[PDB]
Amino acid sequence: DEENVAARASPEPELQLRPYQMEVAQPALEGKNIIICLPTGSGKTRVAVYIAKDHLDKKKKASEPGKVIVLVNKVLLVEQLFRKEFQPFLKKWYRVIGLSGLKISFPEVVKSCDIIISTAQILENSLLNGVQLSDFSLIIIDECVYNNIMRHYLMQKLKNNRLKKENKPVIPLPQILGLTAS
Numbered sequence: 500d501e502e503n504v505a506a507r508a509s510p511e512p513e514l515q516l517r518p519y520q521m522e523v524a525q526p527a528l529e530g531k532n533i534i535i536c537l538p539t540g541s542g543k544t545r546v547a548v549y550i551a552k553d554h555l556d557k558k559k560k561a562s563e564p565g566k567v568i569v570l571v572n573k574v575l576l577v578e579q580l581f582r583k584e585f586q587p588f589l590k591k592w593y594r595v596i597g598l599s600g601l602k603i604s605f606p607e608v609v610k611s612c613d614i615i616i617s618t619a620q621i622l623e624n625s626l627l628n629g630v631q632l633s634d635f636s637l638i639i640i641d642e643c644v645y646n647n648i649m650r651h652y653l654m655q656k657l658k659n660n661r662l663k664k665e666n667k668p669v670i671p672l673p674q675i676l677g678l679t680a681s
């Protein structure tokens with residue numbers, strides 16, 4: 500019909516999820532740390548991008564810091580998620596970049612961009628050594644390397660419990676979104 504004719508001439512990618520995908524995303528949309536398990540890579544990716552956009556939109560509305568890092572475990576996945584997914588979906592609203600490993604610096608992409616696609620190793624190197632976990636409001640972990648990052652998170656949670664006891668400000672920690680297909 501008339502609606503269908505128009506839709507057939509509407510080329511921009513769309514980020515409307517199926518109801519099942521919405522159901523499994525819901526706790527992440529509410530800001531809860533969670534794992535999402537989906538049956539396809541394309542589905543997992545679309546859900547990740549939707550959650551990232553929702554997250555950053557809410558932070559902007561609330562005048563709170565918003566910055567997403569997406570961690571993968573292969574250099575080729577960095578360029579894929581950057582150029583084929585997050586950039587085409589969100590470039591209208593957010594500064595997206597992929598960094599895998601020559602002039603571009605990881606600490607500087609963290610300062611200047613809103614969605615950073617990188618490897619777990621690069622984050623871990625920047626952390627275990629320029630960058631802090633608190634810099635990010637959301638960390639998306641593909642195929643949920645990660646033991647050290649997770650220990651680091653948990654230790655900051657423990658440290659925050661001490662800071663609270665001491666009537667000192669806590670250090671902000673990101674929401675964690677783990678993905679697995681499937």
Ligand code: NA
Pocket residue numbers: 537538539541542543
């Ligand atoms: Na799916």
